């Protein structure tokens, strides 16, 4: 549960940044699809990143 909470914290930190760093969610291409980040689309993005971005960190050294 601790890693499942820290991954949600990292996802909310990287999607919407602080008041000094522009986050990834502040973009004209993501606001057209959805206005508010629903947890269903969040889990869909998580599943797609687990399907595709896994060899990025698997072969990283």
């Amino acid at each position: 549960d601790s890693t499942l909470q820290k991954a949600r914290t990292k996802f909310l930190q990287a999607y919407e940044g602080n008041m000094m760093v522009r986050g990834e969610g502040d973009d004209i291409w993501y606001q057209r699809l959805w206005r508010q980040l629903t947890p269903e689309t969040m889990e869909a993005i998580v599943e797609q990143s687990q399907r595709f971005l896994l060899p990025l960190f698997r072969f990283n050294q």
Binding site: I28, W29, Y30, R32, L33
Partner: protein, 124 residues
């Protein structure tokens, strides 16, 4: 209050994968997949207006200008070129701050780019 709501933008479109798909298309796809779905499939590119002219001279370096200066300084220091000539070139265009502050900025950027080049050209 008798109207239909906004349906979802996501719809299953017919698409046939061609024979010859170049590497540049895959790079533009995997740089941003939603942008490549927008500006290439439906050809919708949201063209934002250009930034206005600032009212004063640049006292600091931040954003795209600092990144371009760091890129040119790293491309100059990777060949062990004269950093002072590029300093005079950037000072002749007015992109650097006036007087000593531009020299301090160029000195700290040259220190950072030399620290990066000592790792870059170590295995080149």
């Amino acid at each position: 209050q008798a109207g239909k709501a906004h349906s979802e933008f996501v719809q299953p479109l017919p698409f046939t994968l061609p024979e010859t798909v170049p590497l540049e298309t895959l790079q533009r796809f995997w740089a941003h997949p939603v942008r490549a779905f927008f500006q290439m499939r439906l050809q919708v590119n949201f063209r934002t207006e250009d930034s206005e002219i600032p009212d004063t001279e640049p006292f600091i370096l931040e954003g795209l200008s600092r990144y371009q200066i760091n890129q040119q300084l790293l491309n100059a220091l990777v060949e062990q070129d004269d950093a002072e000539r590029l300093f005079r070139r950037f000072r002749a265009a007015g992109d650097l701050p006036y007087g000593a502050f531009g020299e301090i900025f160029w000195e700290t950027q040259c220190q950072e780019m030399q620290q990066l080049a000592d790792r870059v050209i170590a295995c080149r």
